[PDB]
Design a protein around this ligand. Structure first.
Ligand SMILES: Nc1cccc(C(=O)O)c1
Length: 185
């Protein structure tokens, strides 16, 4: 009906533990209170179609695909689950690696973007087709051309050790899990 569901997971399920393990990797002192699997077939189908397209233009390489974090306010959760992340809601300004949506390797970095008035913070785990990346820059509205030739698929803070990714194309992201956690108890 709304085109999506959010399915609360059991903490005894291995699916839960996989998500929790990744969060806990860098926020081990916080307390996960719920994890919901985002179920949106249309966003999944388009993402899988994009991955397929990237595989065809890749020169036989695997498409670089990562589970990355995105901190947001609870107010945006259902919007993201239905329409995907959209960087133009509030816009981008300040320290840019480009005008696109941002994702972090470490949960710990996304904490700062999980605004709350309350003790309960909310963060997404997303499936991101990062592909081939180059360092970002504030003026970028797309990834730049590769040298010669073709374009990069994403931008990062560091080619040698990337921890922040910017995506300019929503078909390269699938919102996977909503993680609710507390900093207290
Ligand atoms: N890495 C990175 C940079 C900026 C915002 C975020 C986020 O979690 O929203 C992540």
């Amino acid at each position: 009906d709304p085109g999506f569901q959010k399915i609360t997971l059991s903490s005894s399920s291995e699916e839960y533990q996989k998500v929790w393990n990744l969060f806990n990797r860098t926020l081990p002192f916080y307390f996960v209170q719920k994890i919901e699997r985002v179920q949106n077939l249309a966003l999944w189908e388009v993402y899988q179609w994009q991955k397929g397209q990237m595989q065809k233009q890749n020169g036989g390489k695997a498409v670089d695909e990562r589970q990355l974090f995105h901190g947001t306010s609870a107010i945006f959760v259902d919007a993201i689950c239905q329409q995907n992340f959209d960087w133009r809601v509030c816009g981008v300004h300040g320290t840019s690696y480009g005008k696109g949506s941002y994702f972090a390797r470490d949960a710990a970095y996304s904490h700062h973007y999980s605004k709350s008035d309350t003790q309960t913070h909310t963060m997404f785990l997303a499936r991101v087709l990062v592909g081939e990346f180059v360092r970002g820059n504030a003026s970028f509205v797309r990834p730049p051309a590769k040298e010669g030739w073709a374009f990069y698929d994403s931008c990062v803070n560091s080619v040698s050790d990337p921890s922040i990714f910017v995506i300019f194309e929503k078909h390269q992201v699938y919102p996977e899990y909503v993680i609710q956690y507390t900093t207290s108890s």
